[PDB]
Design an enzyme around this catalytic site. Sequence first.
Site, PDB file in Angstrom:
ATOM      1  N   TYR A 157       0.848  -1.221   0.000  1.00 57.48           N
ATOM      2  CA  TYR A 157       0.000   0.000   0.000  1.00 57.48           C
ATOM      3  C   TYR A 157       0.886   1.275   0.000  1.00 57.48           C
ATOM      4  O   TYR A 157       0.693   2.156  -0.852  1.00 57.48           O
ATOM      5  CB  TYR A 157      -0.911  -0.032   1.243  1.00 57.48           C
ATOM      6  N   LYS A 161       1.252   4.228  -2.782  1.00 60.16           N
ATOM      7  CA  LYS A 161       0.851   5.610  -2.494  1.00 60.16           C
ATOM      8  C   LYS A 161       2.001   6.610  -2.582  1.00 60.16           C
ATOM      9  O   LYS A 161       1.812   7.710  -3.079  1.00 60.16           O
ATOM     10  CB  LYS A 161       0.141   5.646  -1.136  1.00 60.16           C
TER      11      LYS A 161
END
Lengths: 251, 253
Positions: A157, A161
């Site tokens: 993740y 990001k």
Amino acid sequence: QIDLNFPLSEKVAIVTGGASGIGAAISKAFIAKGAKVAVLDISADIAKAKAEELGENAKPFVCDVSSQQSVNDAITAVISQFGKIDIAVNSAGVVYLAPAEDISLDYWDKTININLKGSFLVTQAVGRAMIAAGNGGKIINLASQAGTVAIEEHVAYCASKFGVIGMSKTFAAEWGKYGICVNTLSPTIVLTELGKKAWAGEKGEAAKKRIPAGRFAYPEEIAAAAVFLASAGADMITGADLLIDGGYTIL
Amino acid sequence: APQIDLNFPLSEKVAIVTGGASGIGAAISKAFIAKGAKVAVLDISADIAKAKAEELGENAKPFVCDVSSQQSVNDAITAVISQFGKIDIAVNSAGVVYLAPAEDISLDYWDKTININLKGSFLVTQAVGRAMIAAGNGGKIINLASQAGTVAIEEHVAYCASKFGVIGMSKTFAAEWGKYGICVNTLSPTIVLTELGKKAWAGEKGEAAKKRIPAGRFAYPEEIAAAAVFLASAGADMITGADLLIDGGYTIL
């Protein structure tokens, strides 16, 4: 003259992931501000229901952001329906968590393909349209507090990001010359229907201890920031990452 | 504090270096050998890896690895442990560069970049870290990022996405693996004068680039290797999650 009510009257906005969660809140906020909204989602049924709910200025489009064909076809369809695209928001993300030594290649690839490649494909297709039209534009990519700090179990993740932010900054750099502002919005934990469920009880109480604001963000608050960044009050904001994190990342 | 040897020796430590047969990986391999380490030279072909390992002498051994393949990476780590017994240090230096204007850049350039630079770094860091955790003796992992992990650069939309990603990924490994004594850091160079890089910035191209670097020149591979020696040493046990820029000040303006 900058209108300090930040109107979006008659602007045409795309919102990916627009039928649920943060994306639904952004679509609703854009409709309230007088915009036309193209509600893009991987599920035709979900998109159809959301656009019907939001009324005559919202139209549904199927879009799998990980697929270049699906993205290009959606952008074309939005132009055919509304005439132009002034604003695009990328809020189709996924979250797949596991300890870093365990996390599967499947969890990794899904995260990268949807969160990072998907943002790439949508930003590129919308930007090409905006370049051709010659009237500038606004692109707002959802990143996360996890684009600034590491978080345990978030190896994929966080990679996605942080990547979204570097990617978006490069688009911003190259497309200033075309009047296209490209920014990221980075929330902390958000109380979507899912997030309410996943952060209920002591788990949520423990997470709030580390946020100076002492609570999580509402999807409506994320949408308020999107409204500002989409407006004529933000034409000199580009390449920016706006954290909506209640202070989480500053400690 | 222990006796910290300020010569920063790597005596008898075992290091894996991806892209170890050319450019920055080659310089890092050479530096590590010079500091007493055993080095597993990983590269995409048996001949290329063999030639470097022979050049570097008896403490360097060759291994085939395609960092974009989970199977290849896992097989390589297993073979290194068979050959040397342990892994103490891993450097990911097998990156690629594919450039084009953001509105034009192909999905092919995007994928090749992400798969090697970002997914490859994930696969190697995960496989190496597993071995390090199991052995219980800590470790060092040094992932090559770039100045492009901090700033945007025109034509680098895929490259910047991959390099920002590498930093975020690496910081998460660092956070989770501090408890196992594994330091995970990134090294972020400006333009480096690898054999290739020399050819690539030979022009006024190079002279204009240098005008924007406070140091007034590009970095040599041996300078990147010096920083790697420092980060791999016992003088850097409290450095983890750090991104060390070796950019002549490019990114600060």
